[PDB]
Amino acid sequence: MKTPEDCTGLADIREAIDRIDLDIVQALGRRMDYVKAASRFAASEAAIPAPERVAAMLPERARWAEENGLDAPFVEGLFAQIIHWYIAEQIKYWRQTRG
Amino acid sequence: MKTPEDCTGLADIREAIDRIDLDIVQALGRRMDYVKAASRFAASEAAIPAPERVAAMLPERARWAEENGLDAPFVEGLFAQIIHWYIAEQIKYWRQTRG
Numbered sequence: 001m002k003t004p005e006d007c008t009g010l011a012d013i014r015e016a017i018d019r020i021d022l023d024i025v026q027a028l029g030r031r032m033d034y035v036k037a038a039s040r041f042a043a044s045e046a047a048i049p050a051p052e053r054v055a056a057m058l059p060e061r062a063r064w065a066e067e068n069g070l071d072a073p074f075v076e077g078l079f080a081q082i083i084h085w086y087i088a089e090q091i092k093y094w095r096q097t098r099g
Numbered sequence: 100m101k102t103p104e105d106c107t108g109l110a111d112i113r114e115a116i117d118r119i120d121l122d123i124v125q126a127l128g129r130r131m132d133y134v135k136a137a138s139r140f141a142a143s144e145a146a147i148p149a150p151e152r153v154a155a156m157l158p159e160r161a162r163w164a165e166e167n168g169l170d171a172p173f174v175e176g177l178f179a180q181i182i183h184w185y186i187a188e189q190i191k192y193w194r195q196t197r198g
């Protein structure tokens with residue numbers, strides 16, 4: 001596993017990107033564990049989507065993007081897609097655990 | 100950060116989720132370092148998009164999604180977007196520096 005500067009061709013590059021992508025999938029895997037646990041602190045299925053939390057989360061992620069060398073809008077939009085899939089998945093977990 | 104099981108409320112849940120989302124953002128920042136470095140292994144900009152690489156990457160991330168208990172099409176849908184963002188970022192960096 002080589003740093004960007006030590007990479008001598010695309011195989012080296014793609015070895016590190018595959019690893020990074022797997023970390024992202026693994027992190028998303030762990031995120032679902034916390035999103036499912038979040039369902040226990042929801043009094044109803046309507047209490048889950050929590051729009052104020054989403055709206056405040058998103059500019060928070062956009063800033064982190066900038067602090068990491070990335071244009072914000074795309075990263076904000078990416079997290080918008082992530083958060084909504086997890087919301088729907090939480091409702092699905094709430095429905096099967098609470099009816 | 101507590102374990103999913105030890106979280107008392109939404110405050111503990113959100114602490115963990117913020118940490119994982121930041122982990123993802125940082126992973127994306129490092130991924131950019133590698134994508135930018137990859138421009139020096141392309142003779143022309145035409146070589147950059149490399150559709151053959153995209154086609155192989157996709158089902159591999161789908162497979163990883165399943166191995167981590169996530170919807171394959173969803174995660175596969177996220178990467179299709181990520182990858183095309185970085186291709187477009189790569190080309191810009193390429194023109195900028197002329198690799």
Ligand SMILES: O=C(O)c1ccccc1O
Pocket residue numbers: 035038048049050053054083086087090116
């Ligand atoms: O997954 C999230 O971050 C989330 C945010 C707000 C409401 C429900 C959720 O699952």
Ligand SMILES: O=C(O)c1ccccc1O
Pocket residue numbers: 017134147148149152153181182185186189
């Ligand atoms: O970012 C990627 O994974 C990528 C993949 C194929 C071609 C160019 C790229 O930037």
